[PDB]
Symmetry: D3
Subunit: 237 residues, 6 copies
C-alpha cells in the first residue's frame, strides 16, 4: 500500500487504463470489464480490476493535471509492478479539421509544465509514448473501424490560461489535442523504466466553442475505451 | 455549471474551505457544518454547502496539485462568485524545530511550478495569501489556544522529486511546510481579484521520517478546520 | 568592521531603519531620535544609532538597488547582530484604486531580479516579510489613524525600464507598489535568519504620470517614519 | 534557386534522404541510386537525384548541427516541394545495450538547443517525427532482417560538452543515440507542415570508447540506407 | 534636473569618470582636477566638474550594484549630454596568474544579472565597451609603465554569493576581474547610444582572500585614475 | 586525427582562417597562400596549409552555425595546438548608417544560442574576441586604406527566424552585423584557452534590402582576407 493507494501488490494488473475522472474509471469497469472489483477508494480516486476477453486489466482515475497523475503513475509502477499505463482522457482541439468526439493518439506530448526540465537539467526532453503501444492503438482502431490521428498533444498546467496567444502556436505546430497529463505521465514512465501512452477523445473545441457535457465525458466516450482495451490485447503477442 | 462543477450560482457560499481530499470535505460537512447539501460531485470532487454558527460556508475538494486546484478555485470565483478561499491541507516538515501536528499558516508560498512565471512574464511573483485572512487565522487559533507559525510554504509539482538536495535548500530558507497547492491557489486569487489562504497540518516530518496515526491524525485536522472556520467569523465582524 | 561599514559589534541596535538615501537617514537620526551618534560614514552611507522613547534604535541608508541594500543588510545581520530590518521608501502605483500618498506594506515582494533564483535553485521563492513586523506596522499606523494596504510590492532592477508592457502585468496581479529593494532584503533576511519589512509611500502613478508635491512626499515620509518606529515598540511588547 | 541550393523546382524528389556528410550523400547516390545526377554543389553540400526501384529519390547532406540542417530542410520544404525528409546520420550510444553499428529510429528528439523554445514561446515542444514514416522504417527493417530500436534521440548543440554528467541523465531516460540534428529537423518539419524522420547508425560508444573511422561512417553505414529507401516505398502505398 | 542628480545641462563634461564610492570621486576631484566644483550631492552621491591638463572633465560616484549605476549612467547620457563614461573601481581575482595591484580593462563584461536579458529579449547580449576607449586606456597605461590586462569582467549582483562554485566557472573561462557594475553600465551605453569603459585594479584574490595593503591601495588607485584621465586625452585626438 | 579532421599535429599552422564555405577555403589557399597543400577533406570541409609572405598559415571551412564551427575550432585547438583562429564571413546589417561592403569586427558577439549559458551556469557570458587580435585587424585595415567597425555581432541559430521584431532589438542595441558563428567560436576560445576573432563583410542590408553582385561580392572578400592575413603578420611583431 502506497501513500495514495490503499491496495496490495497483485491488486492491480500489469496494465492500467487511467482517465482523469475516477467516475469514468468506474464506468469503464462496469461496462467494459468483467467481474471488476474496486481495489482503491482513497481520495475518491476509484481504481478497479477485472478482466477483458479473459485478460486481467485494471482501470483507475489519476486526477487532473500533471502533478496528480505523476503521483499515481509512479506508485503503480514502483509499488504495484505495473508495466503499461494507458491514459484514456479528454482533450480540447485547436485545429479546424479536428472535430468533436474525435480520437487522437499522442505519440508525443508537449507541455508548459516545468517537471521534465527538472528531470532533464533544464533541457528539452521530448516526452514520447512507447512506440509499440502507439502502433497497438492504431491497429486496434483500424480493426474497430474508428478514425484516429497520431501526433502531438499539449499537456498544460493551466486549464484557464492567461495566454490565449499560445493556442495559435499549438495549432501552427499541429497539436492535435490540448490536455493536462500526457507529458507528465510520459516523463514518469521514462524515469522509472515503464511504458505509457495517451488516447484522448475531443470533448471540446477551443476555436468554435463546441462542447460535450460533464456527463457525456463520463459515460459516452466509448470509442476511446475499446481502442485502448483492444490495444492491450494486441500488445500481448 | 462548468465541466468540473455541476452547480449553479448561489449553490456555494462566498467562502469555501478546500481540502485536497474530497472525502475530507465530506467529513467536514458532516462534522462541522449544519444542514449541508451536496452542491457538487462531478469527477468525485465532493462539495457541500451548510452553515457554521449561522454563517453560510461551503467545503469542497480541489484535488492534488497546482493544475488541479487552479481549475476549481478559478471557477468558484468567476462562475460562483466566491470571495474567500481557505485551503486546509497537510504538509511535510523540513525544519527540526517544526514539530508533528503543528499548524502552519502560509502568508507566502514557494514553488518549483512554472504557472506564475507564465502569468508574470517569467519574473518572480510572490504567491502570497490575503493579509486579513492570515490575521483572521492567527487570532482564531490564539482564541482556541493553538500555536500557529506564519511563514513560507512550498508548493511542489513532483511529490516524488528527483532532486533530494532541494529539501536542504527549503530548510535553509525557513520553509515551514511542504505541499502541492498553495502557490497556485494564491496565483489564481491574484489573477481574478479574490482572496486566498492556506493552512496546513504537519502530517509527516521529512527529516525524522515520522507519520500521523489515524486517531491523532483526524484530531488535528479538526483543529485546523475549526481555526479556518472561526477565522471566517472574525473577518466577518 | 566590514569593507562597507566602519563600525564594531554593539554600534548598531538590534533593529535598523533603512531609507535608500543616507541623507534621509541623517534626517531621521536628528529629528526622530535622541542622542543619535554616527556609527558609519563609509562610501557616504550614513549610519546612526540613538534612542526612540527609550528604545535603542539605528538608522542607515542602504543605497539604490537590490545588490546595494543586500550588501548592507547582510553585513548588519552577520557582523553586527541585527535582528530586525525595516526598509522605508517611496513607490509607484499601477492599480487604479491605489492612490498617491497611500502607505503600502509589502508582506510580499515580487522582482525581475535573479538573486533569489540563484538562492532557491532557480525555483520560485516567495520573498516575504516577517508576519509580526507586518502586523506591528499595521497596528502602529492604525493608532496614528492611517489606513494601510498590505500586499505585494515589485522590486525592479531597472528604474528606467525598457519593458513598459510589464506594468500591465503588475496591475493584473495586484502589485500595490513599485520600488527597488524589498525582494532583495527579504531574500537576505531568509538566507541569514533575520526578519525584515518594507513600508512604502505611493509617491506617483506610473501611468497617469501624476506625482505628489515636494511638501507631500516629505509629510507622508515622516508618517512612514512614525509608523516604523512605533511598530518597533509593539514588537518589543 | 535558394540562398544555399543552386537548383530549380523539380530537381528534388518529393522525398529526400539527408546525412550530415555530403560525401555520404555521394556514396548513397552512387551505390543505391540509378541515373543519379548531382543537383547541388553549393558550399560543397552535395545533393543528388536518381531512382530506387522506380521511385524517384534525392539525397543531400545537411551539414552538422541544428542550425545547418535547419537551413537546408527549410529551403527544401518551402522552395522545392519536399514532403518527406529522412535524416540518415551517425550517433553515439550511452546505453550499454546499444552497441556499435546498431540502427536506431528516433520517434522523438531531445535537445539542449534553444531553437524550439524560441518557436514555442519558451515551452516544451515534443520534437517528434511522422508516425507513418516511423512505422515505415520499422516495417522495412523487419523485412530486411535488421534489428532497430525505436525511441528518443538527443540533438546536441555541443559535440564536445563541458557537462559530462549530462550523459548519465540521457542514459537514465533511455536516449538511444546522441546526435545533433533530429530535434531541429522535426522543428522545421512541424513549423512548415512537412513530414520527417531520423535514422542513425551508432558510430561510436560514449562509455566503452568503441568507435568507427571517418571512412567507415562515410561508406559502410548501409543498413541505415536500405531501411530508409524501403520505407519510402512502403509509405507510397 | 533629475530625482537622483541636482544639476542642469552644462554642469557635467561630456566625459565622466565614475567610481562607486562618492568619497573616491571627491578624492579624484581634489588631487587630479583643477578648479573643481561640486555639481551634485544628492543622496550623498558626490559629483564634481573641473579640468585636467586643459580638458573639461567630470567625476562622480555611481553607487554599488548594476541597478544603482544604471540610474546615474542613464541620466548622464539623456539629461546631461554625456558621451563617454569611464568607470574606475576595484575587482576580485579568480585566475592564479592574475596578481593584486594589476590593472584590468574589461572589453567585455559577464554578469548574473537579468537586466540585459530583459533588454535583449532573453537572449545573450555581449555587454561590451567602446573599442577606442579600450584602446585609449591600453595606450595610456603603456606610456605610464603599466601592463594592462584586457578581457572579460564579471558583474555580480551579490557581493556575498551563496554560489561558491561559480568562481571555478569564472576562472575556467578566463574572467580577469570580479566587480558589480561593468555589465550594467555597458547595457545602458548600448541602450541610450553612448560609449562606456570599465578599468579595475585587482584589490584582492577571491581564492586566498589576500588584500592589498592600505598602502598600495591609493598607490594603484592613483595609477588607475591617471590611466583613465590620460586615455580621455588620447581620445580627444 | 579526429572523426572530422583527417590530419596530424603539425599539418595546421598555429593560426587558422575559417570561412563557413569550404569552397572559399580552397579559393583563399589558391590565391593568397604559396606552397599550399590540402590537409583535410572529411565531410567535404576542405582545409589547407601554406605560407603567406613566408608566414605559415592555414585556412579551412567551419560549416554553418555555432554547433558546426564549435566542433572544428575545438579540435583545431586541443588536437592540433592552434593558437589563433580568425573567422572570415559575411553578415547582414540592421543599422542604417552601416553600409554594404563594410568591414565589421566583433570584439563581442551576441547570440540566441544556449551554448554559453550551458558553459556559464546559465548566466550571461560576454562572448568576446582577443583584444590584441582585434587591434591587429583594425591596424592592418588602416594600412589597407580600409575603415573597419569594431562592435557587436549577432550569432543566430535560425537563418530563418520566426521572430521579426528581433532585428529592431539588434538595431536598438547597436549590433553591427548579423551572422551565425562568432559567439560560438568565442565560447570555445574561452573554454580551451585560445584566441579567436571574427571579421565580417556586410553582404546584405536587412533594412534597405540590398545584396552583393558577384562582381563586388568577391572584391570585398579579398579585402577581408587581405586584412586577416596582414593582421596575423602584425600579431607576430
Amino acid at each position: 500500500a502506497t501513500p495514495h493507494i490503499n491496495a496490495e501488490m497483485g491488486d492491480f494488473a500489469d496494465v492500467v487504463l487511467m482517465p482523469g475522472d475516477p467516475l469514468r474509471a468506474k464506468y469503464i469497469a462496469e461496462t467494459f470489464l468483467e467481474d471488476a472489483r474496486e481495489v482503491n477508494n482513497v481520495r475518491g480516486m476509484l481504481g478497479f480490476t477485472g478482466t477483458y476477453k479473459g485478460r486481467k486489466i485494471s482501470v483507475m482515475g489519476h486526477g487532473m493535471g500533471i502533478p496528480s497523475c505523476s503521483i499515481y503513475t509512479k506508485e503503480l509502477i514502483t509499488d504495484f509492478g505495473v508495466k503499461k499505463i494507458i491514459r484514456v482522457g479528454s482533450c480540447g482541439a485547436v485545429l479546424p479539421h479536428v472535430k468533436l468526439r474525435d480520437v487522437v493518439i499522442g505519440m508525443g506530448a508537449c507541455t508548459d509544465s516545468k517537471v521534465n526540465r527538472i528531470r532533464f537539467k533544464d533541457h528539452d526532453f521530448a516526452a514520447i509514448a512507447d512506440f509499440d503501444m502507439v502502433r497497438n492503438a492504431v491497429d486496434a482502431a483500424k480493426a474497430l473501424g474508428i478514425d484516429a490521428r497520431v501526433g502531438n498533444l499539449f499537456s498544460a498546467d493551466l486549464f484557464y490560461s492567461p495566454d490565449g496567444e499560445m493556442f495559435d502556436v499549438m495549432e501552427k505546430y499541429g497539436i492535435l489535442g490540448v490536455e493536462m497529463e500526457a507529458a507528465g505521465i510520459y516523463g514518469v514512465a521514462a524515469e522509472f523504466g515503464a511504458k505509457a501512452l495517451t488516447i484522448c477523445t475531443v470533448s471540446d473545441h477551443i476555436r468554435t466553442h463546441e462542447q460535450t457535457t460533464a456527463a457525456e465525458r463520463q459515460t459516452t466516450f466509448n470509442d476511446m475505451i475499446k481502442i485502448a482495451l483492444e490495444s492491450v490485447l494486441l500488445g500481448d503477442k
